[PDB]
Amino acid sequence: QYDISFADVEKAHINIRDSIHLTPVLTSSILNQLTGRNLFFKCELFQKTGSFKIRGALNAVRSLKPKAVVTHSSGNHGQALTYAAKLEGIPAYIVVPQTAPDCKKLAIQAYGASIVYCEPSDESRENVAKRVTEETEGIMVHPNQEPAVIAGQGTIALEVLNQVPLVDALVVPVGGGGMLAGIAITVKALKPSVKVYAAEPSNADDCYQSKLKGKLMPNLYPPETIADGVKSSIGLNTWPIIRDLVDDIFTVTEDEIKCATQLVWERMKLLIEPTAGVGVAAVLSQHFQTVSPEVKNICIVLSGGNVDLTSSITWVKQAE
Amino acid sequence: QYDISFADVEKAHINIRDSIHLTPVLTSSILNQLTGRNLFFKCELFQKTGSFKIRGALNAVRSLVPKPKAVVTHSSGNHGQALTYAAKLEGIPAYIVVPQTAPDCKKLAIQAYGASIVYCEPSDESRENVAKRVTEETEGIMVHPNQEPAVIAGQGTIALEVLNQVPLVDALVVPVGGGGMLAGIAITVKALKPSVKVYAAEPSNADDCYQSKLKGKLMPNLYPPETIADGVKSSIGLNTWPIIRDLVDDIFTVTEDEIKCATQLVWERMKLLIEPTAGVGVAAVLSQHFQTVSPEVKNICIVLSGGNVDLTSSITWVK
Ligand SMILES: Nc1ncnc2c1ncn2[C@@H]1O[C@H](COP(=O)(O)OP(=O)(O)OP(=O)(O)O)[C@@H](O)[C@H]1O
Ligand SMILES: Nc1ncnc2c1ncn2[C@@H]1O[C@H](COP(=O)(O)OP(=O)(O)OP(=O)(O)O)[C@@H](O)[C@H]1O
Ligand SMILES: [Mg+2]
Ligand SMILES: [Mg+2]
Ligand SMILES: [Mg+2]
Ligand SMILES: [Mg+2]
């Protein structure tokens, strides 16, 4: 028994299928050549609010009249929860790290939420959200540890398994592990021979360290990574699922993330945020070569497209 | 009559369909809200080589194989890449004449697809003259980016798709450079559904098409244009001008700032990495002058013509 069940994911699908489009799966002959795999890209960047977080947000809201919804977010969960709350006429307060990209801070306010900045650490996020929840008498909807959220994210895999029936592996970027855990439950329940692989920045590598050690090891210092959506540590609800049901974790460096993100931009014309480049970098990575040649058909989740163009100017690289 | 007919477009479709993408039409609630219209975006940025030019290039190569020592053209980059790809499929060397001031991303892709690149001065005259000389030197066949009939016919296949995907469209909005796409679309639309408006969108900083229509004669750009819309610096030509004169309903000019704003809006709201030239059509629908367009012209298809953007080049203006 885990904090969600397959049944939870099925119910989540029922709860949100009238509210979100089924995002496309796209392909690139070039990326296929570069990796020597048969790649399929699940385009969550086209989801309402620009990331898959709409799934968990809609599921959580439908599963909840309350005075307000509250959460902490690097931006995507915040935008998504604000939109879902607004559908129901519920006020939203989003606790956001000071260092979040401007595009995410501005979008949250565009959708009508009150934004409250916190310090960029797990502790500050959690503590400030708890206080805001107390002060507003709101309902806290955690970005990755809330069962209704995790089950919502898992619906990605229901779609993938139908869109790509012969898939051999899903590759999933991991932060708090909400998406990874929901996908792992879904894939392992329906099609256990399909691999579930996590992709994680080296600069925020708690999930990798945790799996290696076989115990939950949160990030010690606040992470600094261009993959701004996966700075969260994994938590007590998602760790057991990841521990038991995820096949392997691949870490990728800042430079690998930057190169893979630009590659998708230039070759596929999909404006993924760098956090979504993490999964692409994983498949391009040296260690991924160790993956059996039999694992041919790989679906990478392009998890979001909320990228700060003015910020991306710092690191955009000319061909060398 | 004109240098192509609808039968030419139909034939082009037969010639190329097995080799190209039927590109999607995407939408955005936000862009609808901002413009007050119901917009349909024809996503040629997902075409092979990153723009619609694969259509004209494949058509020309398939039409003109009946093999030369080489194919030659001049291009700001998109036609160059497309022709190189089409030629490579047939084992034919490519020579592309490219203005010095073309984006690096385009210069490098042409080289990556295996062509020889020859830089020219950034003018209509230099492009045409150097391409002529290279054709003669290589004993190649010249495939013009916008005045070659097989190229015009190929580009018009966009409209065949649009009219099936968006059957009750009220207007198409099309960025114009040399007028190959505009003319091919105009021919197809006015043949199949003449009540559908065909509108061109053009940078004010390269506004020969607008000036031509305004003055009722071909008025090429007098100075080399300077515009972020790097793929529409070409003047319209002798084969496309009569089609545009007679069959295009209106031309909307847009400033550099409007192009930048519309390009970023598509990036941020729709996550489609259009090049700024493809932003020209979006900026037109957002422009003050487009507000003079009747409210009954509500359902509008904009051609997102390419996605070949130089991100290093974009740093200067991205804000
Ligand atoms: N004010 C804003 N500032 C920055 N980004 C914004 C702003 N408003 C919306 N966005 C971004 O625009 C993208 C699209 O938003 P959203 O999904 O709400 O609209 P849409 O794409 O028009 O909707 P649909 O595709 O369902 O018609 C998201 O990535 C969102 O973050
Ligand atoms: N070396 C390169 N430098 C920059 N851009 C490149 C380079 N090679 C290819 N591109 C760009 O990559 C994009 C995709 O290229 P292309 O259509 O040939 O392949 P693909 O997208 O992998 O193919 P498909 O979608 O049919 O599987 C195009 O915009 C092209 O300009
Ligand atoms: Mg492609
Ligand atoms: Mg981590
Ligand atoms: Mg959208
Ligand atoms: Mg012009």
Numbering used by the authors:
A (entry chain AAA): 4 to 67, 75 to 330
B (entry chain BBB): 4 to 69, 75 to 327
Paper text:
Human serine racemase (hSR) catalyses racemisation of L-serine to D-serine, the latter of which is a co-agonist of the NMDA subtype of glutamate receptors that are important in synaptic plasticity, learning and memory. In mammals, D-serine is synthesised by a pyridoxal-5′-phosphate (PLP)-containing enzyme serine racemase (SR). The first mammalian structures of SR, published in 201031, revealed a dimeric structure with each subunit consisting of a small domain (residues 78–153) and a large domain (residues 4–67 and 156–316). The roles of Ser 84 and Lys 56 as the Si and Re-face acid/bases in the catalytic cycle of hSR are generally accepted.
In this paper we describe the first ‘closed’ crystal structure of hSR bound to ATP. In this structure, Tyr 121 has ‘flipped’ outwards from the core of the small domain, where it is situated in the holoenzyme structures, to form H-bonds with the α-phosphate of ATP at the dimer interface. There is a radical change in conformation of the side-chain of Tyr 121 between the malonate/ATP complex and the holo structure, with the side-chain hydroxyl group ‘moving’ approximately 10 Å from interacting with the α-phosphate of ATP to the main-chain carbonyl of Ser 84. Malonate resides in the substrate binding site with Ser 84 pointing towards the central carbon; in the transition state this carbon is planar (see quinonoid intermediate). The binding site for ATP is in a pocket between the two subunits. The adenine ring sits between Ala A117 (from the α5 helix in the small domain of the A-subunit) and Arg B277 from the large domain of the B-subunit. Residues from both the large and small domains of the A-subunit make a number of hydrogen bonds to oxygens on the ribose and the α-phosphate of ATP. The β and γ phosphates of the ATP interact with the B-subunit, accepting hydrogen bonds from residues at the N-terminus of the α2 helix (main-chain NHs from Ser B32 and Ile B33, and sidechain OHs from Ser B31 and Ser B32). A magnesium ion, coordinated by two oxygens from the β and γ phosphates of the ATP and four waters, does not directly contact the protein but helps orient the β and γ phosphates of the ATP, facilitating the interaction with the N-terminus of the α2-helix from subunit B. In the malonate/ATP ‘closed’ complex, the C-terminal residues are better ordered and Trp 325 has good density and reasonable temperature factors.
